[PDB]
A paper describes a structure:
[name]-4,5-dioxygenase (DOD) is an enzyme that catalyzes extradiol aromatic ring cleavage. BvDOD belongs to the extradiol dioxygenase superfamily and catalyzes the conversion of L-[name] into betalamic acid. In this study, the properties of BvDOD were characterized, and the first crystal structure of this plant-type [name]-dioxygenase was determined.
Crystals were successfully obtained by screening and optimizing the conditions for purified BvDOD and diffracted to 3.08 Å. The crystal structure of BvDOD, which included 263 amino acid residues (Asn6–Thr268) and one Fe atom, was ultimately refined to an Rwork of 16.70% and an Rfree of 22.00%. The crystal structure of BvDOD conformed to the P3121 space group and accommodated two molecules per asymmetric unit. Superimposition of the Cα coordinates from the two molecules revealed a root-mean-square deviation of 0.186 Å, which highlighted the high degree of structural consistency between the two forms. This pocket, approximately 20 Å deep and 585 Å3 in volume, was strategically positioned to facilitate substrate binding and catalysis. In the substrate-free form, the Fe ion within the active site was coordinated by the oxygen atoms of three water molecules and the Nε2 atoms of three histidine residues (His15, His53, and His229). These residues were strategically located within loops that connected β1-α1, β2-β3, and α9-α10, respectively, playing a crucial role in maintaining the active site’s structural integrity.
Author numbering: 6 to 268
Amino acid sequence: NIKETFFISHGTPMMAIDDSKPSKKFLESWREKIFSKKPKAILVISAHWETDQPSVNVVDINDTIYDFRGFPARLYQFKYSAPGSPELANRIQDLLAGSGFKSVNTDKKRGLDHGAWVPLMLMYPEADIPVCQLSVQSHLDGTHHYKLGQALAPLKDEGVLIIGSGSATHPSNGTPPCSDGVAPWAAAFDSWLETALTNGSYEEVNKYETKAPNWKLAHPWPEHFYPLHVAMGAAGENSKAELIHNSWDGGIMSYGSYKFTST
Ligand SMILES: [Fe+3]
């Protein structure tokens, strides 16, 4: 049914209201210009939900979680009450367990963190498509998440839109900006990633720690990068990666987003 998986950049919560971000106009054009098909359900691997073992969201309605401090009060008024899919949740449990993940937990009470509901509120604003969330295991490695994606790969034939939500670059809150360029280290890293992805060098991206330039500056902590790996795996071995968006915030926080097309 569905032959694509995506990695997008959840940005920061300001992307719900800051229209000075091309990221927002990009996400808003989702159903018209990016993915026209209506998916049966949506699975989001969001970087803002990390756990020790794979964890799935099992609720019939997602609560809208404001996992951010220090923003306009308008942001805490938002509700993206999309349904959950216990169907999909179980399907994910079984698919993951069937591939070697013996311990895979479930949370029957939590909804969507801003890593899911902020983008989804722009792409699918009616809030009527089931959204189920998968967690990222930050203290593991990239290959683990590639495998989590491979395990999820069959979900596509069942109308599931697999989306990893992170940031192409996620420099520390302590990294200094660039006044009117794009920081050299960040362009190096983004260039590396594109060259890897568009050529299907997925083993390389699994091994970013030993092949990417400036990865410690780009991803000091991996959580915002591992959803890329998951979408990568879910697309498949010979999928075709395309860069569908890029924009920068401080000259250092890339918003790059990729579409993986299985063949
Ligand atoms: Fe974030």
